[PDB]
Amino acid sequence: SFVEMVDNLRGKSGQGYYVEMTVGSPPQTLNILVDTGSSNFAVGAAPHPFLHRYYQRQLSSTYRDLRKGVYVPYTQGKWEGELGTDLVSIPHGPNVTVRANIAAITESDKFFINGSNWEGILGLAYAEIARPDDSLEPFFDSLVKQTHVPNLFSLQLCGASVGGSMIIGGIDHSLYTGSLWYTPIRREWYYEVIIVRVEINGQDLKMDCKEYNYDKSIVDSGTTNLRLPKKVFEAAVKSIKAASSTEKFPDGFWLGEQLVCWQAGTTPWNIFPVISLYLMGEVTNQSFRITILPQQYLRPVDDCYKFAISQSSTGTVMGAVIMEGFYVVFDRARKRIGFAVSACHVHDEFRTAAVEGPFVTLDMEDCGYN
Numbered sequence: 001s002f003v004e005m006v007d008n009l010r011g012k013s014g015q016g017y018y019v020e021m022t023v024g025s026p027p028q029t030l031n032i033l034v035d036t037g038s039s040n041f042a043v044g045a046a047p048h049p050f051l052h053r054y055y056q057r058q059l060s061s062t063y064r065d066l067r068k069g070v071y072v073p074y075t076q077g078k079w080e081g082e083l084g085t086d087l088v089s090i091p092h093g094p095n096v097t098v099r100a101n102i103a104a105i106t107e108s109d110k111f112f113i114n115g116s117n118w119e120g121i122l123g124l125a126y127a128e129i130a131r132p133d134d135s136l137e138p139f140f141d142s143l144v145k146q147t148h149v150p151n152l153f154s155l156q157l158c159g160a161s162v163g164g165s166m167i168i169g170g171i172d173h174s175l176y177t178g179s180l181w182y183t184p185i186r187r188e189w190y191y192e193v194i195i196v197r198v199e200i201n202g203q204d205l206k207m208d209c210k211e212y213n214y215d216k217s218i219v220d221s222g223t224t225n226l227r228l229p230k231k232v233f234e235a236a237v238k239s240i241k242a243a244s245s246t247e248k249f250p251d252g253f254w255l256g257e258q259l260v261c262w263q264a265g266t267t268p269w270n271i272f273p274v275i276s277l278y279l280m281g282e283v284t285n286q287s288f289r290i291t292i293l294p295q296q297y298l299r300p301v302d303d304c305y306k307f308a309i310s311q312s313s314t315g316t317v318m319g320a321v322i323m324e325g326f327y328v329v330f331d332r333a334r335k336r337i338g339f340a341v342s343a344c345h346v347h348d349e350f351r352t353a354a355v356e357g358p359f360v361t362l363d364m365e366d367c368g369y370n
C-alpha cells in the first residue's frame with residue numbers, strides 16, 4: 001500500500017521539497033516541487049541556466065496544446081508559459097496515469113533556484129486560486145476525478161540534503177506518534193486555517209486574535225519560513241530578543257539577512273523560546289496547540305544559522321519550518337488539516353515539539369478576518 005510512497009521526497013535545505021514525476025509519451029522524468037500554497041502544475045519547457053533538464057512537448061505523442069497563455073506570480077518569483085495537457089505519472093506514488101493540465105514555462109523571473117534539483121511545481125491547493133482562472137482544473141482534482149485515489153494526501157517533511165514523504169491518497173501511521181489533531185479548512189482556496197492563540201515560552205502574546213489571521217493564515221509547503229503579519233512579527237521578535245538577550249546578534253540577523261555562528265556543538269539552544277500556535281478545533285469552543293522548537297526556526301546554513309521567521313503583508317504563512325516538526329494530513333474530503341508529531345522530529349535535550357489538546361477557547365469564530 002503506502003509503504004511504496006514512504007521517502008519519496010528529496011530536497012536541499014531552504015530550497016523546497018520535490019517528488020519525481022513523469023510527463024508525456026514516452027515518459028519524461030522530472031523533479032517537481034510539492035507546493036500546497038498554489039494550484040498550477042507547471043514545468044520548465046525551455047533552456048534555463050538553473051535547469052538541468054526540461055519538458056520537451058515536441059517529443060511527447062500525447063501532448064495537446066490548449067492555445068492559451070498563462071502567468072503565475074508568487075510571493076517571490078514568477079513565470080509565464082503556454083497551457084496544454086499531457087499524461088502524468090508518479091513513479092513512487094499510486095500506479096495510475098492521468099491527463100492533467102500542464103503549464104509549459106517559457107520565461108521566468110527568480111522562480112528556479114540554482115542547485116535545487118527541481119524543474120517544475122505541483123500546486124496542490126484548490127481551483128479557486130488557479131491561473132488564469134478557476135476553470136483550469138488542478139492536478140489533484142484531475143487525479144481524484146480520473147482514478148480511485150481517495151481525496152486526501154499527507155506530507156512528512158524532514159529537516160536536518162533533506163527528505164520526506166508525500167502519501168498520496170491516505171495516511172501512513174508509521175510516519176507519526178501520538179494522536180492526530182484536526183483544524184477546519186476555513187475556505188477552499190489556499191489551505192486556510194484559523195490561529196486562535198499564540199504563546200512564547202508559555203506566555204500569551206495577548207493580541208486580538210484577528211491579528212494572527214490578518215488577512216489570512218495558510219499552510220504552505222513551498223515557503224521556507226514562518227511568515228507573520230507585521231504587528232505579530234514585531235511582538236514575536238520582541239519576545240524572542242528578550243529571551244536571548246544573554247547573547248548579542250547583529251540587527252540584520254533578526255531581518256533574516258545576516259547569519260549567526262557558534263563553535264560547533266556550543267549553540268545555546270536553551271536561550272531561545274518555544275512558540276505555541278493554537279489552532280481552531282473540530283468541536284465547539286475547542287482548540288489544540290502545536291509547539292515549535294528553536295531548532296525549527298533557526299535554519300542551519302562552526303554552526304551557523306539564519307533566523308527563519310519573517311514579516312508578511314499578506315497574512316500568516318505556516319511554512320516548512322512549521323511543517324518539519326509534524327506529519328500534516330490534508331484531508332480535502334472532510335475539509336480539515338491534521339497535525340501529529342512526526343517520526344522524524346529533531347531532538348532538543350530538555351524540550352520536545354508537541355501537538356497537544358484539547359484546550360477550551362471561547363469565541364473562536366471571531367478570530368477569522370473579514
Ligand SMILES: CCCCNC(=O)[C@H](C)C[C@H](O)[C@H](CC(C)C)NC(=O)[C@H](CCSC)NC(=O)CCC(C)C
Binds near residue numbers: 015016038111131317
Ligand atoms: C497564484 C496564487 C498562488 C500563489 N501562492 C504563493 O505565492 C505562495 C504563498 C508561495 C509559494 O509557495 C512560493 C513557491 C515558490 C517555489 C515560487 N513560495 C514563495 O514565494 C516563498 C516566498 C518567501 S518570502 C521570504 N519562497 C520561499 O520561501 C523560498 C523557498 C522556496 C523556493 C521553496
